[model samples]
Target: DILLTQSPAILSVSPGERVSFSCRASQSIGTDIHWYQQRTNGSPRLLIKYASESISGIPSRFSGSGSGTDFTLSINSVESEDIANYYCQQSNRWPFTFGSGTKLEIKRADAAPTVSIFPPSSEQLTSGGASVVCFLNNFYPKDINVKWKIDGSERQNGVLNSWTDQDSKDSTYSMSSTLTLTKDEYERHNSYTCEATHKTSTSPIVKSFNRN
Candidate 1:
């Protein structure tokens, strides 16, 4: 069996970014390269098998290419949860050897955050004071600022909280902000808005909800 070695033993990428890594075999292994993703606290999972074919349940963002002694694994639009240790193994013979794993880290995102707004529930709608939540998803670096506005005016009563996605290996995070609105304010305001600010974005990302 041939021994596999991966170059640049570490990789860093941000969400929505692309990256490629190379694996060299001691000798020709043809299309026998298989890829696996191992997280800090989870079992290894197969990512790409048979060199370039897709594996079941694996996201379409992952792929492999190349043949002979040189092979490559590429990830497109990498997500924060994809951060982990990646290894390549050979299946040409018994006692397969795996490459020294490459650690993948989450870099800061250079794109704006995706934002959405959720209206108050029925119970809250009937009450004099209700809370509306603004959700921020798929952002990088785990640092962000969230704010609320009513009728185009900024408000300071909103509460913001953030958390990383447990399922991912990357340092990506999601955030939420809740704004309490009195029944009179909710009914009187033509629009409510949530604004998200991050270093990667040139301008704040905002989403608005209007009462019809």
Candidate 2:
């Protein structure tokens, strides 16, 4: 029975900070530990082979150390692009053994999103339906939930969309979503609320639109 334990399941760090990880093996596995990095929507890439050998073309900042039962992967200076999941695998045995991945969130965890709700535009109101908008700005981690409610019931027809590379000045993310309702339904509804659930907020942050 062999087990690999990876410390710091989730790490939140700013750019230029040095990061370190400890990958431990239940038994002495020698220099069999290798490291891999998997970014969002990307397959895992081998970073370190045979415990400490650097892969060709890989950045010099990524370095691996230790041997036997204990191994480590360290980043000389973590960057925005290095935000990914890191896993340690032991190749000495017949069976493939890999530790639970460590997810890296690029931005520091304190910046909550600044949310705003905009009422339907004149063009949108003249069309088939009224389309309201919710703006999620300067959000960190980019893993957040946005929900739209009319009066109190959640709307099923709400459209969720996101944009990348439109990061804020702080390097946080920005995106928006739309909620559609018939013109008649829009007039009948008293209040429309946009709620966002994020890591820093204890409760969902909310913004509302009220018919005049």
Candidate 3:
């Protein structure tokens, strides 16, 4: 069985910029490699057949080059809708296997969201347990991820994506996420932290809250 390995597992690309992916075969598969693109929640569609041959409905900007054990998929100028996951599969082998895949993410042009975290409060809380809150504002596209970290340990079991609201005037996004822990669990941790990740951010923005 021939194996195709794709490079640059994740790529963040802006519209109008050129992007490419490399798929190397464990053995020479010649021009038998084929490429397919799968969009978010969409089925995979053939993009390049027989390594360098173009599919009928594929755009001219999408192309492939290379043969044998090495191959490349090149996109001449990315459109906003070009964001997708691409992979290559070798057909010359008995047992066909596709490359792991390269995910192309549309680079967000909007500014990073403002992030804030609040310590647990006694209001509406039963006993001594606490609920930490992470609030985000001024974001775009309305998709973001939030997580809770307490005592340097990541916790996802208690996270609640409570509110997600977008402003109609400007289409900006805002949301608040909550993390709940029992009194004993809260007391066991010294500090709680929140992390927010958005497309415009290279790294997650982190903020800490103290139970004191």
Candidate 4:
């Protein structure tokens, strides 16, 4: 499988403007394509797909079209809370992969507000020891923290890191937390909160994956 990369970390646009990003595959993967959106502290939700036809509960303003080697994901009438990162993934093979991501920002071109992006992308490496790192890119209003709270009890320290480019005005933040567990701890930690805090608001995104 070929890894994916996204450019322009931050994307700026007007409220009613149409926005899109390109997703390219390493080789011909047929028609398998997927799109996802992640708010400050929310679970990555599916926006479109080739299989299942459509995503449930997703707004009609979001649509995706493309096939063969390239694809596009577009959203219409940008919303305030929708000012987050968007990603593209392909399920055409094992170990499903994702594009870096595009952060949507509202800006103005003709005296009207618009949304623009600045290469909002991320890299995630899964550690074998039951730990995961949530890398959030192009985040603003800095004072943010990420934590892994299991079963309502706070866990140990996490490595919080951030970087900003002097000329680019872009920032990338990351936090990693480890889960030490016996078989029971692993089984019981099905529901946990991945929280992100900033001056604007604190968001807690929950993730749950179950398999036999």
Candidate 5:
């Protein structure tokens, strides 16, 4: 498999402006390049495929074109919501590899979310299994990801609830996740961690709590 590298690690763009970025593969990967857009607090979304073919659900403004070892991703009239991290991957052989990624930032500034983790409320903390809540508040773009970990292991069994402030003029958003662990599991674990990833942060925000 060929390795992919994206140039201009960061792209500063403005709304209604045209933007383009490049991806280079170590070896000829033909038209197997796949492009993804990773918004600041959300999972990666497919934007383009086969170097130029469009994927379902992707905006028409996003496009890709190239062959072999070179490829390009372009956006026509970039929007503020288009600010995100872009990655390219090669699928010519086994074990695919992705580019280092290019971060797309709007010329304007934005705010990251403030995160907090609260202990189980009510009697659950003392009764048996407990439900812990992770809160993310006051963020722009309304996209976020919240993950839970117990004793250094990732846990996916949880409910995530999120919403945007419809009446707020700032277009900010908030999200929360509740993780439930059995009494025995909670008592046995020594630590719990909540990780929040958003566009406003260059790195994931991780908060850990020690169990008593």
Candidate 6:
């Protein structure tokens, strides 16, 4: 797998603003490409390219125009629509790689710290309550923890999951986690969080979601 990087950790674009992200492969891929979007708790979906000649079932507002190592994903007249993390991947190669993600903030300028929410997600509310899950694309350290907090209260005796970071021959890592919620707690929203703390990395990444 090739290394992929993105610039401008945070992007502030006003409505109707034209924004672009650059995805470069460490080595030449020499094949077709695809782009995906992940909003918070939602599953990643493909936006354009490689898979089909046209991007069917995708929003008309979102369009991709590019090919090969140099490609561009364009959003004409940005709206409050689809504000989240956008990534690019090379379908032409194996062990797919993704861009760090460009977070879109809704504001003319001077935007606040925020996270992108993935759309079209489903939750099952039953006797079981809701739980939090943590995932890291490529976690380096083996010692890490996934904790759940309900309205600032630490949670225990809940499902805790972890995975070993894949060490590709080229020197990359992969890891992920999943926390399950009981049906009784699934209906509650904005009252829980999934946090991952790395023993030797930067601060942990906390993800929260609200039920609609």
Best of the candidates, TM-score: 2
* TM-score of decoy 5: 0.53
| C-alpha RMSD of candidate 2 | 5.8
Q: State the lDDT at 59 in candidate 2.
A: 99
Clashes of each: 2, 0, 0, 22, 3, 17
lDDT of each: 0.82, 0.83, 0.81, 0.57, 0.80, 0.59
TM-score of each predicted structure versus truth: 0.54, 0.66, 0.58, 0.49, 0.53, 0.47
lDDT computed for candidate 3:
0.81
Candidate 1, residue 112: Cα displacement in angstroms equals 18
On residues 39-94, what C-alpha lDDT tens digit does candidate 4 reach at each position?
76568988888822568798888777877777777777765556677887878888
Looking at model 1, residue 77 earns an lDDT score of 85
Q: Rank the candidates by TM-score, best first.
A: 2, 3, 1, 5, 4, 6
Q: Any runs in candidate 6 off by more than 4 Å, and if so which?
A: 51-53, 108-212
Over 94-191, each residue of candidate 3 has an lDDT whose tens digit, in order, gives 89899999987655458677999987666635677777888888787677888788788888898888554334334356788888777677776787
135: Cα error in model 6, Å: 29
Ten residues in sequence with the least summed lDDT for candidate 1: 161-170
Model 3 misplaced stretches (Cα beyond 4 Å) = 112-159, 162-212
- Name the runs in model 4 displaced over 4 angstroms: 108-212
Across 86-146, the per-residue lDDT of candidate 1 in tens digits comes to 9999999778889998887766634456899987777887767767788887676666888
Q: In candidate 4, where is summed lDDT lowest over 10 consecutive residues?
A: 112-121
Which portions of model 2 miss their true places by more than 4 Å?
A: 107-131, 140-171, 174-178, 182-212
